[PDB]
Amino acid sequence: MRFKKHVVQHEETMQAIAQRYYGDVSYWIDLVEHNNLKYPYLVETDEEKMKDPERLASTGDTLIIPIESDLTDVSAKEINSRDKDVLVELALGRDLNITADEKYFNEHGTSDNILAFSTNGNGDLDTVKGIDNMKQQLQARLLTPRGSLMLHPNYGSDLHNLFGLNIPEQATLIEMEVLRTLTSDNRVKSANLIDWKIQGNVYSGQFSVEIKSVEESINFVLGQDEEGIFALFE
Template sequence: MSIYCKHVISQGETLQEIAHYELGDMSKWTDIRDINDLEYPYIVETPEEKLKNINHLLCVGDFIYLPKTQKVQNEEDLEDFSIDDYDKKEIYDLVVGRDIYIRPDLDCLLDDSAGIIVADNHKDIKLTNGVYNVFQSIILRIMTKQGSLYLHPNYGSTFTDFIGKPINNTNKILMENELERTITTDRRVRSANVTSNSLHGDTLIFDIEVKLEHENVLLSFYISVMNNGYVQIGLYND
């Protein structure tokens, strides 16, 4: 078990500058790199850039861990921990962002009433983060008609245009392509794949797998669409 102190990364800081001002020796920047398991370019400006190599990059506002030195004066800033036990899930939840939780009305028409803002136990607006935040974003992208959002003409999907049309092989392929295209417009998504589609009476069901910008994160969910416009969306790995 090693002793480390925390430092919050400021705009424009480099490992060399942190080593110079916090450790008194610029050459110790490699120690900081190794302790935090960083890879070039080590520190980036935005969470979006960090997603490109989330396990080995830090961004402005993140904590970086430094070896204890004589310069450390505030013992409250010291922590006993093992780098191997560092909670990467908490980091990922922070990086992918936080948003207002919108409870989808899953037995609903694809229209403006398809989501409801709810309160938490403290009567505040409920928030969501992490993987579910990405899933919520995917739902909203699919359910929003492309071009309907003011000042964002490319946001949304044409998927709903197919509802009510004949369910034939051509339309199913077009729907699959539009689902995959829409989902991958979210920069937190690495890839999207409609793994199957099946017809049950007047209901068409798509099974979808989405790989996020993290080596261990895979979303599996389904979308079922009825000819009357009603849909159901749900996570398989909820």
Template sequence: MRLAIYEIREGDEPHRLAHRLLGDFRRWTELVELNRLDPPYIANDPAPYRARGLRVLGPGDRLLYPYAGAVEPVGEEDAEAETYGRDLLLQRGELALMGGTVAMVRGLENLRGALERRLRTRLGELPAHPDTYGHLLHQYVGRAGGEAELRYILLEAERVIRQDPRVAGVRLEGELLDGEHVRVLAYVEPIPPGSPFPVEVVL
């Protein structure tokens, strides 16, 4: 099954998206199952639902959908780029240049970079999505609690990673480095066709 990505807009609803993307409003359950969504599935403000641990998409989030268009077969690299997207390459938070132009990253490397940015961005720091993008890890990092603190950190990191519809599964490990920093290592299983890969951040 070939997959494509649609960016959610304000006012989108599963039935209407199924009609627009799949040609049949009755196929809305396919979108819900493919993206592992919880009721109400899509909301203009998904933050209250996410706070309860529900997987709900909002404006700016990506929705995967089956794509059956008449396209030429593509190689593995092109399939990865189509599935995981393309974006500007950032190095230490700055745009990377290649030959005088802005460099791009695609495929699994784009997904890896996107997940690292999610784990490094506090909720509210991204002006375009102040209530839907980012983490609440700062509530736990640096607080006394040892293993209990680490469990909360890993749960929040998992919630943040699973918000990306290109992630099929994730397993996390963590280590408290000192009183104020923690290392999080995520073993990410992307949706097909990609292979699992690690993401590591120190917070």
């Protein structure tokens, strides 16, 4: 259950509040009955409220409006930028940082024993959030061979076997495998080739990944309020 709570504004009236929320002034008597107010409902200052603190409310006192509010179906335009940042951070999850020391496992991508945990400098375990989290998860999936992870046959990639000849065919195989691995992530709305080239031994390519938009993540997280899990089991 959730309800709206209104702070009494300067020289406000109950009729104005009723019009503002219920869309009709007729509910002011219901608002009085629910809040248990005496006739001078909104006193000028706290000196009048001292006469009867229980049954009177002054400026800056909080009223309760029993309308069943729900955090979904709320216009994203109202939400503050910090609130949107926190919401997308929740949507994209928080995880222990393992992709620290990028150079080392970039020098040995196909091998095992490549990545490890790290500390945040404050004596606690390091953590990657939001975009850093997505980076970590996408790197780990791409780097993991498919079928090597226990309890998860399909998690990973087949790039360890695509060290083939220098022709466009193997390039296309690599590209298709990379697109499959990126599409396997539920959060990745789509992925597509940008450019590639062959320099004899060395292959080079680059991709573009569109994660779910702010609006979708906000809708997902605010829907999750109904359950209260606020966690990701994808």
